[PDB]
């Protein structure tokens, strides 16, 4: 006993995070009966289901220069975009990024917003060629990435600063109003046509190309999904019906929990030691933040009561989010009879000197199961949102976007193929995943186009 006590571990550890295809549908069901829930009142569900304010989405047919601004960090993007019409449709696009000066961060809300309409207006005048205008006034779709309150299509109010931003006057006023005057204080005629949230941005880069998009899901770092609801099988909501009685929800589901949910006692200790115990239990064990850190807790347990790593415990290894996302998607993709990628990747990360085949075999399979718990559950979702769409039984497309589903392949893999097995053999040829890349870059501007003043 002492390597078989690691054995024990990894075998409780698999069994306690099995998804047989059962419990994926009762977890499916449940998806579906929270966003009932979430759309019947608000504070329905811990699925919040947003109003998206979203009038149009993009069809295709747009014609025209559109700008988008991508402002979540210490480092923002401004893009163009020239779009040509159905059969073109993006025919150039260009960005510039641009860092923001760490005083601004701190300082007055005039002083950062200026700055940001200066990047603006020194990145139009590098237009090539009449590239722009029919005389027309210039169209910006704005994503703002730090916690908003969307009031409208062109307004949002700030609800708290993140990643090292403190502006405290800037709380609780509207962010495209801050941004218009600036833009009117620099000289740039420049209309925002849309305040845009990066997962609905992302729907609406999947629909400009294909109209049978009816949902997005994002899994990176976080996790997010949004969807085309019927604007009239919401009851919660009183306002003026969308163009095609869309209504595209934001739907927050990283706070999602249920019962069926297969969780361990190291997704517990990791909530309880979290910032947000409670809550965003979903993204806890989907998202690329929380799969590595999952990983060292199974690890981290093996080495303290079975002495995984010999009778010292790696002091790295007691690092909270030191095993990352693509740390785990290179060791899950080593195919070599010696796993020198598990090994080195372990080295790195822990400073330990030396690892065997064995622990290289039990660090991959932890990271299967992790992984593979990871995409089911995230399939389960999607099949969820297909089930509120009535899309299970029969094209329904689904824009994806995040590290996980685009170089994590196993994890993408996994994701489909449960998907496909839930969906059933007759029903899933009609239903298929996209990549829609950079919505809150050209999934803005695509977004401005579907609400210009002309289109």
Same mark, same amino acid.
């Given at each position: ?192 046509? +849309?305040?845009? !949230? &990066? @997962?609905?941005?992302? =729907? ?7 109209? %049978? ?116 998607? +290179?060791?899950? !993709? &080593? @195919?070599?009879?010696? =796993? ?7 080295? %790195? ?107």
């Amino acid at each position: 006993g002492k390597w078989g006590r690691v054995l024990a571990i990894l075998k409780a550890f698999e069994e306690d995070c099995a998804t047989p295809i059962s419990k994926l549908r009762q977890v499916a069901d449940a998806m579906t009966v929270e966003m009932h829930a979430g759309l019947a009142s608000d504070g329905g569900s811990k699925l919040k289901m947003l109003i998206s304010y979203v009038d149009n989405l993009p069809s295709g047919d747009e014609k025209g220069l559109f700008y988008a601004l991508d402002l979540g960090g210490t480092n923002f993007r401004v893009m163009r975009v020239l779009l040509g019409g159905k059969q073109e449709r993006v025919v150039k696009q260009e960005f510039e990024e641009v860092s923001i000066p760490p005083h601004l961060m701190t300082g007055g809300s005039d002083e950062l917003f200026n700055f940001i309409a200066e990047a603006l207006a020194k990145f139009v005048a590098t237009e090539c060629e009449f590239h722009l205008p029919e005389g027309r006034q210039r169209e910006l779709g704005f994503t703002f990435s730090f916690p908003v309150k969307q009031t409208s299509l062109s307004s949002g109010s700030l609800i708290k600063w993140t990643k090292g931003f403190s502006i405290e006057e800037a709380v609780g006023q509207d962010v495209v109003g801050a941004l218009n005057k600036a833009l009117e204080r620099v000289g740039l005629d420049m209309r925002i046509a +849309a305040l845009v !949230n &990066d @997962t609905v941005g992302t =729907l609406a880069g999947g629909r400009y190309y294909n109209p %049978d998009v009816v949902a997005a899901v994002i899994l990176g770092t976080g996790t997010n999904a949004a969807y085309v609801e019927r604007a009239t099988a919401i009851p919660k909501w009183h306002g003026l019906l969308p163009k095609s009685g869309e209504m595209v929800i934001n739907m927050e589901w990283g706070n999602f929990r249920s019962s069926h949910l297969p969780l361990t006692e190291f997704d517990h200790t990791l909530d309880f030691e979290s910032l947000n115990p409670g809550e965003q239990i979903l993204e806890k064990i989907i998202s690329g933040m929380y799969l590595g850190e999952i990983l060292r807790r199974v690890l981290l347990k093996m080495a303290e009561d079975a002495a995984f790593f010999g009778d010292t415990v790696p002091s790295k290894l007691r690092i909270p989010f030191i095993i990352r996302t693509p740390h785990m998607s +290179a060791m899950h !993709n &080593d @195919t070599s009879p010696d =796993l020198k990628i598990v090994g080195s990747k372990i080295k %790195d990360i822990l400073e330990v000197p030396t690892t065997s085949l064995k622990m290289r075999k039990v660090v991959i399979s932890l990271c299967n199961i992790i992984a593979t718990r990871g995409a089911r559950l995230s399939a389960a979702g999607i099949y969820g949102i297909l089930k509120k769409l009535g899309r299970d039984t029969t094209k329904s497309v689904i824009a994806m976007d995040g590290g996980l589903f685009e170089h994590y392949t196993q994890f993408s893999e996994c994701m489909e193929s449960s998907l496909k097995e839930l969906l059933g053999d007759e029903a899933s040829g009609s239903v298929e995943v996209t990549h829609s890349n950079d919505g809150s870059g050209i999934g803005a501007a695509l977004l401005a186009a579907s609400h210009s003043l002309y289109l």
